[PDB]
């Protein structure tokens, strides 16, 4: 097989540098089971 140079889409120039990056959104709220109730109790106290 033979290869030739291409330069049509500038996005490849940008992909060439950005490949090692990705952006995420942080999700600070979290919910989980626990032996802690509300009002007048946190398991006998």
Partner 1 sequence: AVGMGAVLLGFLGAAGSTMGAASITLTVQVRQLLSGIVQQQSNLLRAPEAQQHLLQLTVWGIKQLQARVLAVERYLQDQQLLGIWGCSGRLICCTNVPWNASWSNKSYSEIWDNLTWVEWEREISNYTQHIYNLLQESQNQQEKNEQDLLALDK
Residues that bind partner 1 (CB under 8 A): 25-39, 42-43
CA distance 45 to 40: 9
CA angle 15, 18, 21 (to 5 degrees): 135
Closest separation in Å from C-beta 28 to partner 1: 6
Closest separation in Å from C-beta 1 to partner 1: 37
Closest separation in Å from C-beta 10 to partner 1: 16
Instruction: Specify the residue for token string 């049509």.
Output: 8
């Amino acid at each position: 097989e033979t290869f030739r140079p291409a330069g049509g889409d500038m996005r490849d120039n940008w992909r060439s540098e950005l490949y090692k990056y990705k952006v995420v959104k942080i999700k600070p709220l979290g919910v989980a089971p626990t032996r802690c109730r509300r009002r007048v109790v946190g398991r006998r106290r």
